[PDB]
Coordinates of N, CA, C and O in Angstrom, one line a residue:
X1 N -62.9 -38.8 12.4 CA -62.9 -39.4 11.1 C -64.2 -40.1 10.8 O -64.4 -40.3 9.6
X2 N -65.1 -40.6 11.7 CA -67.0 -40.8 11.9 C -67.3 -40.0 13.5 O -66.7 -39.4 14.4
X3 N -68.5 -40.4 12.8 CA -69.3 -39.6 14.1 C -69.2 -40.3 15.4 O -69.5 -39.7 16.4
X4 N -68.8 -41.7 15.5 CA -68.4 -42.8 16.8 C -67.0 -41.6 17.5 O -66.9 -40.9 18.5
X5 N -66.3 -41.8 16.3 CA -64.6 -41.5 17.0 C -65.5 -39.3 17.3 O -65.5 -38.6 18.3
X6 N -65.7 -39.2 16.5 CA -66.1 -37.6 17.0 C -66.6 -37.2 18.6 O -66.2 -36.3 19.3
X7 N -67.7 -38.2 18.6 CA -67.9 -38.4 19.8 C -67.6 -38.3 21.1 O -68.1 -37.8 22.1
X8 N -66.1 -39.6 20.9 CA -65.3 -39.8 22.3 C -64.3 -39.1 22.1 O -63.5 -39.4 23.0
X9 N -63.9 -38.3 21.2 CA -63.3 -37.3 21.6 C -63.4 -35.7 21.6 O -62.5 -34.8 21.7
X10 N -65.0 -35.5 21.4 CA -65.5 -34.1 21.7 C -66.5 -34.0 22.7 O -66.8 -33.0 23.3
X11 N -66.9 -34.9 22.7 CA -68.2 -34.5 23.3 C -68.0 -34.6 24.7 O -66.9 -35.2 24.8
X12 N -68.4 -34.3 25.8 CA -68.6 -34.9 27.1 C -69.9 -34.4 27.9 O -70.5 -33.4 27.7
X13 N -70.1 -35.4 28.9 CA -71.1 -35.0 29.5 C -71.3 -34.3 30.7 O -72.4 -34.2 31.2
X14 N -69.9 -33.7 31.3 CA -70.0 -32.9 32.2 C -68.7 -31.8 31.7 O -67.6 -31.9 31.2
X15 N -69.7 -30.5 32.2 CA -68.7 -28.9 31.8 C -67.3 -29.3 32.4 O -66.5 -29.1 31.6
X16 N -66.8 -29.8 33.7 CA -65.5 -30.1 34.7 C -64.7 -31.1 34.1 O -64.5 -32.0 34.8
X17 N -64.1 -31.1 32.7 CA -63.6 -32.4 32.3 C -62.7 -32.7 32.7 O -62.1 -31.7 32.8
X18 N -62.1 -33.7 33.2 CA -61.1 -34.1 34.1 C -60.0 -33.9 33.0 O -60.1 -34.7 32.1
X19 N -59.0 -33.1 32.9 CA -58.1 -33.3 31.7 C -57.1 -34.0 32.0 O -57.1 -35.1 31.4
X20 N -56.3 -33.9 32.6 CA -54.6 -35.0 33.1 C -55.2 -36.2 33.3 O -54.3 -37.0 33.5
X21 N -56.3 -36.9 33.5 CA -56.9 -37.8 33.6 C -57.1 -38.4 32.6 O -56.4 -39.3 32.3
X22 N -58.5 -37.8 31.4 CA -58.7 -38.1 30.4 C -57.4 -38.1 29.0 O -57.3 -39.1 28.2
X23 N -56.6 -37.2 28.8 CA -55.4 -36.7 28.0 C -54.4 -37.1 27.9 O -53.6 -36.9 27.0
X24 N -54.2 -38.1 29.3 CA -53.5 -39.4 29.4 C -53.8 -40.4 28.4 O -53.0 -40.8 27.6
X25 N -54.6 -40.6 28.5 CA -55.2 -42.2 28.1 C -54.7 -42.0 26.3 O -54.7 -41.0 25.7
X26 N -54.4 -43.3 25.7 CA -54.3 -43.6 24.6 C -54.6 -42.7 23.5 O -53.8 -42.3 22.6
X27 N -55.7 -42.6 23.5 CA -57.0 -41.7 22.4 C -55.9 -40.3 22.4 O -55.2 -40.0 21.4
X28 N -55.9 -39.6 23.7 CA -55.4 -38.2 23.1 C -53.7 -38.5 23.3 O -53.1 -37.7 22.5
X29 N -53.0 -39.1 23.9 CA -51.8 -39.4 24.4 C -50.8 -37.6 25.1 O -49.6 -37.3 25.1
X30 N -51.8 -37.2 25.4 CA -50.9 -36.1 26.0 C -50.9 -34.7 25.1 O -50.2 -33.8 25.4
X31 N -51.9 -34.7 24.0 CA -51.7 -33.6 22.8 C -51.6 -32.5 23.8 O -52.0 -32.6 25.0
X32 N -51.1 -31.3 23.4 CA -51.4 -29.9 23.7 C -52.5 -29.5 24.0 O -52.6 -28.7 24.9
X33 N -53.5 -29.9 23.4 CA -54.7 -29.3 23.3 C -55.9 -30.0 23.2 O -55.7 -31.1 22.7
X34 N -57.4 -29.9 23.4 CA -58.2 -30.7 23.2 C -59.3 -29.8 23.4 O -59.1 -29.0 24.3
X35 N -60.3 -29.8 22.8 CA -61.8 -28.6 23.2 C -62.9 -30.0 23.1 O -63.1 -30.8 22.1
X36 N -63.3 -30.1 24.3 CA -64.9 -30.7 24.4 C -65.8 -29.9 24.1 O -65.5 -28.7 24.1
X37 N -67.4 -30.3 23.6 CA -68.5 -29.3 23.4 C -69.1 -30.6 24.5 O -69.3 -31.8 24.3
X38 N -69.6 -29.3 25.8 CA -70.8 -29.9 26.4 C -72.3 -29.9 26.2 O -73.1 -29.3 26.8
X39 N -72.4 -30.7 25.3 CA -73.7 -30.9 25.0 C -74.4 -32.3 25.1 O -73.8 -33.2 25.7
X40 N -76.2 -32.7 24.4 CA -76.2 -34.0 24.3 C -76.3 -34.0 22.6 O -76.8 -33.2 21.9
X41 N -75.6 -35.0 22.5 CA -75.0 -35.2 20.5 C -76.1 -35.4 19.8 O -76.0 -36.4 19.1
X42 N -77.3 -34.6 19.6 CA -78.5 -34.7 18.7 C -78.3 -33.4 18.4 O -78.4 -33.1 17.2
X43 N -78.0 -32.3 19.3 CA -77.9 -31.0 18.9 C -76.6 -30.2 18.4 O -76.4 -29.0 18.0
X44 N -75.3 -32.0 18.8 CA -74.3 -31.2 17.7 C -74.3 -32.1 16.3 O -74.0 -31.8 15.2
X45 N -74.7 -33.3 16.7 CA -75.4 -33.7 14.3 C -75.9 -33.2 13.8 O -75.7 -33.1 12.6
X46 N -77.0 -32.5 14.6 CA -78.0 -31.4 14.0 C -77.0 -30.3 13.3 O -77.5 -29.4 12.7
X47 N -76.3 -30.4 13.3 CA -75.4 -28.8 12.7 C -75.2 -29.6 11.5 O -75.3 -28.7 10.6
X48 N -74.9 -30.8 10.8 CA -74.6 -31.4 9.8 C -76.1 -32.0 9.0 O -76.0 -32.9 8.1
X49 N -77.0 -31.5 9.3 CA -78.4 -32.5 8.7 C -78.3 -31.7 7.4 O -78.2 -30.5 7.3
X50 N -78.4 -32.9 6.2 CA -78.7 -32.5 4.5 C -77.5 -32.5 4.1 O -77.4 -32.8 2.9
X51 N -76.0 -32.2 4.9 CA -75.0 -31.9 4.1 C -74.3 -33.5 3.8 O -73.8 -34.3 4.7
X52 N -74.3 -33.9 2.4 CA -73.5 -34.9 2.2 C -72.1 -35.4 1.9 O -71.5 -36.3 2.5
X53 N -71.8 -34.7 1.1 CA -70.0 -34.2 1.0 C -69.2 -33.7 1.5 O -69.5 -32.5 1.5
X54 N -67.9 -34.1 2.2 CA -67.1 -33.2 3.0 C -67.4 -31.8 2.6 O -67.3 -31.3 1.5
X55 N -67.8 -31.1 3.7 CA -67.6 -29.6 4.1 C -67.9 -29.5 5.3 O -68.6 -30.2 6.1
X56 N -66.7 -27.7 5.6 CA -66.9 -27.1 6.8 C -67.8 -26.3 7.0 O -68.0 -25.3 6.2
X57 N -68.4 -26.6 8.4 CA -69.6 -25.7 8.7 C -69.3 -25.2 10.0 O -68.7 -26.0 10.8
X58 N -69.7 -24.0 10.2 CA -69.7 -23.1 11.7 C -71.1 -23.1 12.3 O -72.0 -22.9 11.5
X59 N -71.4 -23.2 13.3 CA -72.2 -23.4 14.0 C -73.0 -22.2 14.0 O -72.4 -21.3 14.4
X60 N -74.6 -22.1 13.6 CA -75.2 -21.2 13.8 C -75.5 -20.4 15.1 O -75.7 -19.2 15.3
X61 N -75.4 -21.6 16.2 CA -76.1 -21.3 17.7 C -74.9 -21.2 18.4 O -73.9 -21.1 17.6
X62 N -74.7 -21.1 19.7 CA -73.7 -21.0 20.7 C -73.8 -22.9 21.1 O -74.5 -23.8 20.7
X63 N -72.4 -22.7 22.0 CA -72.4 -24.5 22.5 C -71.2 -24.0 23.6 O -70.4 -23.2 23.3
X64 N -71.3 -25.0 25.2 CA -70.9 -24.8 25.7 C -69.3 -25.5 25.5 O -69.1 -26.7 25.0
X65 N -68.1 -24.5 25.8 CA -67.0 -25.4 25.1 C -65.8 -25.6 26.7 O -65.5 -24.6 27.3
X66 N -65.5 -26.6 27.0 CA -64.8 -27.1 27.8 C -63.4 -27.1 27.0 O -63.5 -27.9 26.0
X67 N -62.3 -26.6 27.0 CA -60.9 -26.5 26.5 C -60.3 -26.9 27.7 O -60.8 -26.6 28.9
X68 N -58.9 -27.7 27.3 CA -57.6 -28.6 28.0 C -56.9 -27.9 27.2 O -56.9 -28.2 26.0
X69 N -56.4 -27.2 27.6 CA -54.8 -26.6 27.4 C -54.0 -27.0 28.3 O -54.2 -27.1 29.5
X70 N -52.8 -27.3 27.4 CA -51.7 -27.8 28.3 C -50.8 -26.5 29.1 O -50.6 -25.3 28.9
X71 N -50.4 -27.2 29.9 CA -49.3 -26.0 30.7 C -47.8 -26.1 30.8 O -47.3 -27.1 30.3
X72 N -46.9 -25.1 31.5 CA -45.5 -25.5 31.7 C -45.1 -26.8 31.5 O -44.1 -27.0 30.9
X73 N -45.9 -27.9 32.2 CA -45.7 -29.0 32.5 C -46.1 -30.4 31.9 O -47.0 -31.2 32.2
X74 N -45.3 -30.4 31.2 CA -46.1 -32.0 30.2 C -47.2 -32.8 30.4 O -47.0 -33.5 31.4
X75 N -48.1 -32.9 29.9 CA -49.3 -33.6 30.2 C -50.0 -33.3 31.3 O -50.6 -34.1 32.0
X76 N -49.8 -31.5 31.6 CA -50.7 -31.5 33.1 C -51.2 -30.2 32.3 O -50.4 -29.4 31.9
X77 N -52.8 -30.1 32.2 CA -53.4 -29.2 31.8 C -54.1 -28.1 32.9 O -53.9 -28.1 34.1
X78 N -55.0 -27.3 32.2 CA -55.9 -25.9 32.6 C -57.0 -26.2 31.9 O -56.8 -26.5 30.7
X79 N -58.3 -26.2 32.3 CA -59.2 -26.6 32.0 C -60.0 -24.9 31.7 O -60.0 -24.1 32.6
X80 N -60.5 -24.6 30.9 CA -61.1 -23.6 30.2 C -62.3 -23.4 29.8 O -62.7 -23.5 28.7
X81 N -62.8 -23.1 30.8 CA -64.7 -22.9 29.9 C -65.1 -21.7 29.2 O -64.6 -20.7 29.5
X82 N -66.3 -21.8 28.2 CA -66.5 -20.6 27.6 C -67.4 -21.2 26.8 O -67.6 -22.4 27.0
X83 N -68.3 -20.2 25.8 CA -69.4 -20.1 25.1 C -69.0 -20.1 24.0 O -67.9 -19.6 24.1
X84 N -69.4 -20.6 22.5 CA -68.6 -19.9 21.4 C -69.5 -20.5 20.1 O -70.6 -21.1 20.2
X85 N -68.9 -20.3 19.0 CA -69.6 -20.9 18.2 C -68.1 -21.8 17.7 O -66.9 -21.5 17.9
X86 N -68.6 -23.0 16.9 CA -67.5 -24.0 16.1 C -67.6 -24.4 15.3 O -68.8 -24.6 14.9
X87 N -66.4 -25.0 14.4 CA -66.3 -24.4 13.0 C -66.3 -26.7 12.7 O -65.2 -27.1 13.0
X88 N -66.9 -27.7 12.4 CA -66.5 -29.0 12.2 C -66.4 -29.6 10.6 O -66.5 -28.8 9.7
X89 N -66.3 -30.3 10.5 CA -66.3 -31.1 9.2 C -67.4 -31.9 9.3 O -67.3 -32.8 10.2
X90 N -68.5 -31.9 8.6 CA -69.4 -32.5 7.6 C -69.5 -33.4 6.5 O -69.4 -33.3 5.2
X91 N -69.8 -34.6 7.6 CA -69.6 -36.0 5.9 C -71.1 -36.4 6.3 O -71.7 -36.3 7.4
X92 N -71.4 -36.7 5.5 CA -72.9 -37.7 5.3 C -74.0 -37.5 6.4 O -74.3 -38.6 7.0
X93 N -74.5 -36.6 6.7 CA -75.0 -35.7 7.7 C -74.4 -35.6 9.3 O -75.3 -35.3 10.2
X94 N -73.5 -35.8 9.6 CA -72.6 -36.1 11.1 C -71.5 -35.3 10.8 O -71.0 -35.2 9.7
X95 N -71.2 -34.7 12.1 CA -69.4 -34.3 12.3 C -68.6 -35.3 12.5 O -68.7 -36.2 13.2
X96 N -67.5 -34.9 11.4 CA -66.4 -36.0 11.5 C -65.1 -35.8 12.3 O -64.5 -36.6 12.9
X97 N -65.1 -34.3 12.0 CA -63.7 -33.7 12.8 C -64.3 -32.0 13.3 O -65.2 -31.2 13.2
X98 N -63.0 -32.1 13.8 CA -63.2 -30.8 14.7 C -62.2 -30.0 13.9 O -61.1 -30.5 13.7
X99 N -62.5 -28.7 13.6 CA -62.0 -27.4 12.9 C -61.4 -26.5 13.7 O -60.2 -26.5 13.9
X100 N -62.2 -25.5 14.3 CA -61.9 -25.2 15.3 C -62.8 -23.9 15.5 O -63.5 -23.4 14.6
X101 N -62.6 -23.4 17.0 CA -63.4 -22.3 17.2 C -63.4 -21.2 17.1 O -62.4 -20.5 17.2
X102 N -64.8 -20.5 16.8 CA -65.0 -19.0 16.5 C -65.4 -19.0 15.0 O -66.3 -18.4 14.5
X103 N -64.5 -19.6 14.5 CA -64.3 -19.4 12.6 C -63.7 -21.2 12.0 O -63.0 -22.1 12.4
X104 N -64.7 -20.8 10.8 CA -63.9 -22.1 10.1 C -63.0 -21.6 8.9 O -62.3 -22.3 8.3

């Protein structure tokens, strides 16, 4: 909903995201699902420079994506790596939300 809350819940700084650890905690409370982009966050604002009004944009370049998918078992995930391009929302040159991957 800003680029603060976008942050701590997309970004991270290492590809191995601890998921039943992090997915716990308050912020995600257990969701199904969660995709990090490992990157450092100048090259994922950069995807929003000039755009001022809500809109979705897909990423021109690739970005490394860390996915938490949940399993059989409540709040105990599979951790997922891959390459991809991503689809975010765009307010006042920053990502606000996450859309999702491949396609917006």
């Amino acid at each position: 909903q800003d680029w603060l809350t976008f942050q701590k819940k997309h970004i991270t700084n290492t590809r191995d995201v601890d998921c039943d650890n992090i997915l716990s905690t308050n912020l995600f409370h257990c969701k199904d699902k969660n995709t990090f982009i490992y990157s450092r966050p100048e090259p994922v604002k950069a995807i929003c420079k000039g755009i001022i009004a809500s809109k979705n944009v897909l990423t021109t370049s690739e970005f490394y994506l860390s996915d938490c998918n949940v399993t059989s078992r409540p709040c105990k995930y599979k951790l997922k790596k891959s390459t991809n391009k991503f689809c975010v929302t765009c307010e006042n040159q920053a990502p606000v939300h996450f859309v999702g991957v491949g396609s917006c």
